[PDB]
Structure formats: structure tokens, C-alpha cells
Amino acid sequence: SERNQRKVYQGRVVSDKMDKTITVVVETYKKHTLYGKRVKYSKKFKAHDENNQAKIGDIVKIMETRPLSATKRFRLVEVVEEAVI
Amino acid sequence: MIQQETRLKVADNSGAREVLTIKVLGGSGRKTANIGDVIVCTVKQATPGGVVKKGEVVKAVIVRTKSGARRSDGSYISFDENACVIIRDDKSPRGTRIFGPVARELRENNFMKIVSLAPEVI
Amino acid sequence: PNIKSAIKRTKTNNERRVHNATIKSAMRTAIKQVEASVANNEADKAKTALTEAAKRIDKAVKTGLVHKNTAARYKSRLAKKVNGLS
RNA sequence: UAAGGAACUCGGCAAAAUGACCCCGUAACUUCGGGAGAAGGGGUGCUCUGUUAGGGUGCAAGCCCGAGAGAGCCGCAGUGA
RNA sequence: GGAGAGUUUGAUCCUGGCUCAGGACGAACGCUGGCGGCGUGCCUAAUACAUGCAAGUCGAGCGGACAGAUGGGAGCUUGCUCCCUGAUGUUAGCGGCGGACGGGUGAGUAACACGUGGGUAACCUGCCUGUAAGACUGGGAUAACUCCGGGAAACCGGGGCUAAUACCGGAUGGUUGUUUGAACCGCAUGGUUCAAACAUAAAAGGUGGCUUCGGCUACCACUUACAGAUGGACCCGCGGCGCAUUAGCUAGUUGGUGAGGUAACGGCUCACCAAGGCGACGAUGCGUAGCCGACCUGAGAGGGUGAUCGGCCACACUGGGACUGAGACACGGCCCAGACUCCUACGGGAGGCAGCAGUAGGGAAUCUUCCGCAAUGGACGAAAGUCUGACGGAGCAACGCCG
RNA sequence: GGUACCUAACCAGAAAGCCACGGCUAACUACGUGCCAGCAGCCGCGGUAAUACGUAGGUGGCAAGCGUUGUCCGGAAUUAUUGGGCGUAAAGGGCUCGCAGGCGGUUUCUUAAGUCUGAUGUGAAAGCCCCCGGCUCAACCGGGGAGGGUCAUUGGAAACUGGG
RNA sequence: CCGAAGGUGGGACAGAUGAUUGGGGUGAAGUCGUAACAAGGUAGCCGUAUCGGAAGGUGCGGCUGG
RNA sequence: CCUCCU
Numbered sequence A: 001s002e003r004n005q006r007k008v009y010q011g012r013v014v015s016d017k018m019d020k021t022i023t024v025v026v027e028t029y030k031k032h033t034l035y036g037k038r039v040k041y042s043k044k045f046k047a048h049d050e051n052n053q054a055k056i057g058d059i060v061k062i063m064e065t066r067p068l069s070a071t072k073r074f075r076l077v078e079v080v081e082e083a084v085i
Numbered sequence B: 001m002i003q004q005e006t007r008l009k010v011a012d013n014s015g016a017r018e019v020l021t022i023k024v025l026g027g028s029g030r031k032t033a034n035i036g037d038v039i040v041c042t043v044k045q046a047t048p049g050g051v052v053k054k055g056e057v058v059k060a061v062i063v064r065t066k067s068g069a070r071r072s073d074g075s076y077i078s079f080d081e082n083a084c085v086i087i088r089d090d091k092s093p094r095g096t097r098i099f100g101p102v103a104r105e106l107r108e109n110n111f112m113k114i115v116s117l118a119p120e121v122i
Numbered sequence C: 001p002n003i004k005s006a007i008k009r010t011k012t013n014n015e016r017r018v019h020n021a022t023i024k025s026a027m028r029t030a031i032k033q034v035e036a037s038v039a040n041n042e043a044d045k046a047k048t049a050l051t052e053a054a055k056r057i058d059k060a061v062k063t064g065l066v067h068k069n070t071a072a073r074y075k076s077r078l079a080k081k082v083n084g085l086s
Numbered sequence D: 001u002a003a004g005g006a007a008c009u010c011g012g013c014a015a016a017a018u019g020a021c022c023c024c025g026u027a028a029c030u031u032c033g034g035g036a037g038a039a040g041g042g043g044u045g046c047u048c049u050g051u052u053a054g055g056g057u058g059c060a061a062g063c064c065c066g067a068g069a070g071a072g073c074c075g076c077a078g079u080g081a
Numbered sequence E: 001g002g003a004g005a006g007u008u009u010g011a012u013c014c015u016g017g018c019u020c021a022g023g024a025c026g027a028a029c030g031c032u033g034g035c036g037g038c039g040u041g042c043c044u045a046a047u048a049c050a051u052g053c054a055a056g057u058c059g060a061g062c063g064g065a066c067a068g069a070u071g072g073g074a075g076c077u078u079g080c081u082c083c084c085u086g087a088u089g090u091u092a093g094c095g096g097c098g099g100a101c102g103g104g105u106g107a108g109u110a111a112c113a114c115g116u117g118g119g120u121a122a123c124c125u126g127c128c129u130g131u132a133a134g135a136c137u138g139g140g141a142u143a144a145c146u147c148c149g150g151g152a153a154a155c156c157g158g159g160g161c162u163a164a165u166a167c168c169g170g171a172u173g174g175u176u177g178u179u180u181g182a183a184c185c186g187c188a189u190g191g192u193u194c195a196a197a198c199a200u201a202a203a204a205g206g207u208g209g210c211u212u213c214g215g216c217u218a219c220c221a222c223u224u225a226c227a228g229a230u231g232g233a234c235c236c237g238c239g240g241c242g243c244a245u246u247a248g249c250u251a252g253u254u255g256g257u258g259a260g261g262u263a264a265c266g267g268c269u270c271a272c273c274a275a276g277g278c279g280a281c282g283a284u285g286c287g288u289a290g291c292c293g294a295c296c297u298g299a300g301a302g303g304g305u306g307a308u309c310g311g312c313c314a315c316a317c318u319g320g321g322a323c324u325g326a327g328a329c330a331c332g333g334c335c336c337a338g339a340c341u342c343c344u345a346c347g348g349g350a351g352g353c354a355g356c357a358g359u360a361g362g363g364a365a366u367c368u369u370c371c372g373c374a375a376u377g378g379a380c381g382a383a384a385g386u387c388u389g390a391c392g393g394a395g396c397a398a399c400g401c402c403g
Numbered sequence F: 001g002g003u004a005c006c007u008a009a010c011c012a013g014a015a016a017g018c019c020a021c022g023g024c025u026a027a028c029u030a031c032g033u034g035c036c037a038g039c040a041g042c043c044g045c046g047g048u049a050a051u052a053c054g055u056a057g058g059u060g061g062c063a064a065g066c067g068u069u070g071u072c073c074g075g076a077a078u079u080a081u082u083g084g085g086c087g088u089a090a091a092g093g094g095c096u097c098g099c100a101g102g103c104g105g106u107u108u109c110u111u112a113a114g115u116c117u118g119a120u121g122u123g124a125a126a127g128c129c130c131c132c133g134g135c136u137c138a139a140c141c142g143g144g145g146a147g148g149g150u151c152a153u154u155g156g157a158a159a160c161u162g163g164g
Numbered sequence G: 001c002c003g004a005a006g007g008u009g010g011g012a013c014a015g016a017u018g019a020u021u022g023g024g025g026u027g028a029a030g031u032c033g034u035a036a037c038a039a040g041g042u043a044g045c046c047g048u049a050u051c052g053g054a055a056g057g058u059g060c061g062g063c064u065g066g
Numbered sequence H: 001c002c003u004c005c006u
């Protein structure tokens, strides 16, 4: 099927305790509008992990979905990296 | 049966909410006033922004009482409360609206503007 | 109102609702019959109730009350309960 | 004890009112302890679910303590004195 | 594509503010005033409003009054009368569509409201125009009109009726649901296509003409599928205000599971579980604010503004709720409450100028109680046409820009 | 609306203005006041010879108006990213220890978030503007472009910043 | 059941106003002294304490901008 | 010790 993809993101798993759910933090370097320095921005996200596989440190990719709760808007597509301790 | 110190609800939109009876008018040692009698009174509670202000001495006509009133046919009327309407010397109400039912007795005393403005006259 | 067709639309819509409520009530009552039958363990009656339900459901769709998706949702819910009995 | 409600009186004197338990909630100010039961509110009988959950005792049977719920029932009024 | 000047001293250089020359405006006020052509004109009280007018239409749905008279009849003062229902006309009342647009105002809103972002696999989508099936067979009621009772009344309840393109019954219907499998797959939840069974679900005829009076038509038009299109709904990244002399906030709060609801995804609602979520990258609170196209200014960076004109949003005397539907949880509707206006013989009714004009009030200050749908665009209708303070014009005012 | 526009007389008749004139910024003398009366954007004028006040006569801009007050941007490299400072002009914290943060020697390999780059989609119409045309030029309307994104999506490059 | 308005209650916040009171600013020619500027006639100034109509004085420590 | 205002 020739489907246009939704906006996909990747980041570190900062939260996990919420079962069936995670917080993925897409850190990035937005330029400041006036002064032009790369400032360390960080957008948190809320994705879904049905199996409860992800943990602290996992640099997972997530893709947009139907609203899976009030805050949740994404799914755990794949655990790319698997950090431990 | 309203006497000195009786507090009344004000049944109008003049600004006064509660009045204290200073004097029953109409004779020297007159103890008690009933429906259709005029009283001098002070405003104890007022609505903020109203025409009539707290502390003003004013005339009011009693329009409902708990004691109520007897009619020549041997029937009576009573209300759950004592209430009056602030008036000018010509009997016209200082407010523009009357709240709650008033007694037929006000027609007899020629408080016509009040009787016309009242939602019910029993 | 203070318009001719407004006064008609006032008088019309009242008379429509009454008629309309009938059919919803009829539907909802017919839905309760199926729901009641699940408790008693009687599928044979639930099928014959589900037909009368489904009739009353679809009459509301025709008039312009129950949306097709709304009806779709109801007949789903009921049929799962009937099959869940057996 | 009608209506009124401190008009009484030197003075609310006397009387009335408040009053139990559980729950919510509680200001100024403060020596940071307090203030505080501040204030202001809500619940409270009986029946069934029900020898409830749970707890004590006991090998058990049993006995004892016992929330909080839901559904009802009655009265003007359930800490009905 | 970028200009400076005056002013601290007795005089000096510097630092440093202040002031001026420029442009802009919905301006106001003085004084003065000729005409013309385009444009602009409540920024204050989202204050209250007298009066009028601003959405009504379809008789080719409609029984019915009330007319029509082509003709016959018509007693007979030819003067007037008439008795039948002419083609068909006027269309209170019923039924349909529209009234959710167009118009107005920016009160609220610091929010996915907006400006630039997806599912379209989470949705909806009447009207319009296509391609694809049909209007077959049951009746039963109800306005008006009438009868009766009300209402001084305003308005209205019974009784017998009558119609409809109003409504309901049943068959067979691809839709829809369920199940039985397949086929094929995506971005996980899946999606798309096909076949049978079970279950459910359709319509409406009014005109003009021809009927071999069996019927067959055609514009309009009723109903069903796959489309396209159109207009809505949700979601998301990222953007764009002030105050820390606002540092903690939250308890349906954060996620789960289940149930319900919704066109639709979802604490959206609830039950039962846990204990989360947010925040120094400024949460929370307070203040202010419709956002955007743009506009003014400037070499530009920036700064300010968001009247007029276009788009998105929100609101409609204040506040709450649903009904009808493809679509308002309604701008000239209703239901309920509140404060105000009106009527009421007192029981009860009616309305909302942030529609055009206008009035009062506020204010430094902002128009005509105007003419016309001829034009453009709507709504209705097959059309003629009707309605249209939308709109076109004109009145007013040196308020601009320019002839 | 018998309104625009034409003809044709009465005929250039009906159609000139306001403000400013120390300096900034091109533009002066009588008289009457006498620190009074008054003036004033700033500097400042007037106490008995006022080129800035009251009056009277006299002149550069733009063109039925222009003065006055109000608001905004400029001038103001005067909140300074572009583009400023802190010995004495305003300005170094009294001095440490340090959490977060900011910043970080050299080589090499690898990565590719940042950085750069190609291609594709949208950023309505009006307005302002590039060529700009038409309406007699205008105080105005059309088309094709451009800008418009710290924006997607994808393919490269890999020095530099970041990660191993 | 939910539920607008209403009622009751105790808090929070903002504005207006208030007897009186506090300094502040400004104001051609008021009164008192003379603190500072010169070694300003006791070098001045900084912190702090205390005292005094008032500038100020005095102590302690500091600075040179003596 | 003080030295009116412009």
C-alpha cells in the first residue's frame, strides 16, 4: 500500500514505570532565534510498549498513531539500542 | 405583629435587603404594626450598588407577615416571613420591582403601585 | 418567535420529537429485551428479540435519528452477547 | 407559650441555645509549641446482602470484636430518653 | 543600502541623557474653507434602547374555503337578478426546502484558538454532478374547515371529519451487523477485494402530451450502491505575550484493565486497580490578548499595530440544556433560570438594535429613521416571479489619498 | 438619473489655500509694553531703544487646507545578534568550595545528531514588490515569477561541532 | 442520577476611600548655624555604634579618591 | 561666622 508515513521520532527512554507506556525524550539542538547559539532543547513524548520490554537508556524509535490515551500519541515501533544499568 | 426592633426582609429591588423597625407610625403608644401599616426603619443590610444604602432611615409598608391578617368573611392569610417595601411619602415604592406575594389588604390602604407591581396578590 | 416560518418550525419540531422519541423508546425497549434474555439463558428468544430490535433500530435510521454508525455499533454489541451465551 | 427577639437591665443577671461519636474543613496572630474542639459544614435509626472485609481466641466446632459498602424500610424527628 | 543638529564648560575633549528636523493615523481640536474623483467614518458603554425595516418562498404536494365563467339554465322592470362548477385563479391552514448562509461584534480565549504540520487504517460529508438498483404491495391518523367548550382577552382544549410529495405494515434489496472461509497484505491498532447463509433495511408521485385506456414517455422528482467533489471533525511537530516582588502544581490527576458513550480516537464518562504526570527548557498563579494574510516604520536587523478589506476562531441580553437534522448543542427558534422592555380586566403571554437607519447615555470624537433589487450574489420554484437594510446607489462629514 | 460626458453661448468669468521665515531648516523692521502683560519643542525672551510678546507693515515650502494636541517607528551602534560597556564617567560579586549548566589538548578510526548540499510538495486571494501590461497616465485592475520553512520526505558529502 | 441560577460559610486577591501620620519633590529674594570644596581652618570619605536643634560630633576598624 | 534675587 502506497501510504504516506506519519511523523516519526527517535530518543532515549526517560520513563517506563507507566505500564503499556513510555516517555521518549527527543533531545535536539534548536538555534536560538536572535543570538543563533545551538541551545540544548528536549521534547518529551508518550509512546506505547505493549510487552513492557523497554527500560532506562533505550534509544527507541517511535511513530505517530491514533491517540492511545489522554497524553499517549505514539507506539514503540522498535527498541533500536538496549542500554543496561 | 411588627414592633420596634423587628427585622424585616425587603420585598423589592430598592437596594435594602433587611430593615430594622424604628417606629410603628400612627399614634402615640402604638405597639404593633400589621400588613398595610407604615413603619420607620433603618437599613441593616443592603445590596451593593442599590439606591437605598445601609444606615438610611426610611419609611416602609409591611406587605407580608407571619401573624398575617383576618378578613371580614372569617378567613385568614399568613405568610412564612415578615416583609416590607421601602416607600416615598406618597406610597409609591422606591424600587421598581416587588418580589413575592403581597396581601390584598394593600389595596384597601391605597398602595396601588405596589399591588400592581407584585407577582401575586392573595 | 416573531417570524412566520419560525412559528411553524416551533410547532413542527415539537410534534416531530414526540413521534421520534416513540421510535427511540421502542428501540431501547427492544434492546432491553435482548439484554434481559442473556441473564435467563434463552438464546432462541434472544434471536427473535434481536430481529425486532434490529427492525426498530433501522426504522430510526430511516427517519433520521440513529446514525448508521450508531446502529452498526448496537447490533455489534448485541450479537457478541448472543454468541457469548453459547 | 402566639408575634417579636435584648426593645429588658447598671450589666443578656437569669434562662434559652451549644453539647456524643465519625468525617470534611479551619483565619489573624505566634514565643513556631500553639491559636484549635478555631470558625463553618456533613453523617448517625432499622432491615437485607451478612455468622460482610478484616481482626482476637481455638486443632476444629464455636465464641468474641468489627469497618466500609450496596440495596431497601419507617417516623415530625434516628447520639429519637 | 545606512547624512545629522542643538543643549553640561570661562574654554576643552569625553561620557551621558534630553530636544529637534522624517514618515505614519479610523484621529480630535482651532481658524479658515471652492469644486470634483476614489477611499474612509462608535477606537469610548459586548451600555440601555422609542419606531420602522433586515428571510422567506414552492398551488405543477395539499383538502379547503373564496373567486373565475367558456357555455347551458335564469325570473324577466333589458333593467338587473342570477342556478349549475369553465379552463383554472387568490392561497389563511397543512406538507417541503431554506432558515446553521449571508450580515454583525471581538466579549471570552495564553488554547492544537491560530500560523506552518497526519491518520485519512479513528471520522463525517445533505445539496451538486456521474456511474450503478428501484417508486411494488398495507392501511391508519390529523390540521384547516367545521361542531362544542373555553378565553374581555391575548391565545387554546375537546368531538366528528377530509387531504397530502406528512406518517406507519410487509416481501425482495448489494448497504449494515453477525458468522463461515478465502484472496491479498500493511505503519501496530490492521486494511482492501470476493462468495454463501442468518438478520435487518427502499420510494411519492404532481405537471404537460400521447394511451391500442394493456400502457409507454419525458423535464421535475422520491428511494438504494460504488464514485468524484464539497464543506466539517479529531490528532501532532514546530512557531509566536508580560510578571519569579508568582515555586511548587495536579487527585479523573498519570497510566492500566473493563464497561459505556461518540460520526469518530481518546479519563471522553464511569467501575476497579495501582502510583503516576507536570515543572528552573518556568510548571502553577496573576495580568494582558482573538490568531493570521497584512499594515506602519526602518539600510537592514528589528520594533510597533492587527480599524477598513480576505481567511481561521469565538460569541449572539446574562447563564444552563437538549430537540430537529447531512449540519446548530441555533444572529433575528424553543425549553428552563436571571436582570431589563412590552402586553395582560392579573390567570397568563411577547421580545432581545454586537442586522440597516435612528435615539439616549458615555465620550475629544465618528453619518441618512434615504432610494432601488436595474447590477452582482443568495434562498425558494419547472418557470414567471417573490423576499433580500446582503448588495448597488445616493445623503452626510476637508477625515484621508489624488485629481 | 435627465446623473456622468458632448455642443453652445453669458464668458477665463465661477476654482486659491494654509502654514512657516533665531539655528536646526532657504527666508525683518516700526510702534506699544517695561520681570508687567505675556512667550516657550529645545536652548531661552520681557526689569523703559525686545530681529523670539501685543500689534502694524513686510517673505520659502507643499498646494483648500494647514496649525495644535495624542499614538507608533526613525534618527537613538541609546538594551548593542547585526552593533555598546564596567581602573578614575553608571558598572567586577568581599572571598572561596562547588551542584546543574556553558565551554573544552593532539593523533587516528568509525558514526552521522548538528553542519552543508541535490531533488520533490505547499506557503490562498488582495496588498507591497521583479519584468511589468491594460484602463488617456492615473489617487487604479490582469497574468507569469519571486520571496515565503530553525518544514517535511529522501539521496549524498563528512572538514568542523557532537557520539562510540 | 447529573445539573444552571440561588442560598449559607470561612478564607484568598484587587481597587476606591479614611481621622491622622511619614518622609519625598518643587517653589526670585524667610529663620538658624557653617558641615563639605583650599591643610576649608579638627584632611576627607567608607562600614558600624552612640550622642546632639540642624548640618554634624565622637569611638573602633578601613581607604587615599589627603 | 556670614555675604539677598535676576
Ligand SMILES: [Mg+2]
Binding pocket: D001
Ligand atoms: Mg414566645
Ligand SMILES: [Mg+2]
Binding pocket: none
Ligand atoms: Mg414562635
Ligand SMILES: [Mg+2]
Binding pocket: none
Ligand atoms: Mg438597652
Ligand SMILES: [Mg+2]
Binding pocket: none
Ligand atoms: Mg430601658
Ligand SMILES: [Mg+2]
Binding pocket: none
Ligand atoms: Mg448566665
Ligand SMILES: [Mg+2]
Binding pocket: none
Ligand atoms: Mg479582550
Ligand SMILES: [Mg+2]
Binding pocket: F076
Ligand atoms: Mg536602536
Ligand SMILES: [Mg+2]
Binding pocket: none
Ligand atoms: Mg565619583
Ligand SMILES: [Mg+2]
Binding pocket: none
Ligand atoms: Mg564609578
Ligand SMILES: [Mg+2]
Binding pocket: F092
Ligand atoms: Mg574583586
Ligand SMILES: [Mg+2]
Binding pocket: G034, G035, G040
Ligand atoms: Mg567648614
Ligand SMILES: [Mg+2]
Binding pocket: none
Ligand atoms: Mg574640616
Ligand SMILES: [Mg+2]
Binding pocket: G051, G057, G058
Ligand atoms: Mg559627644
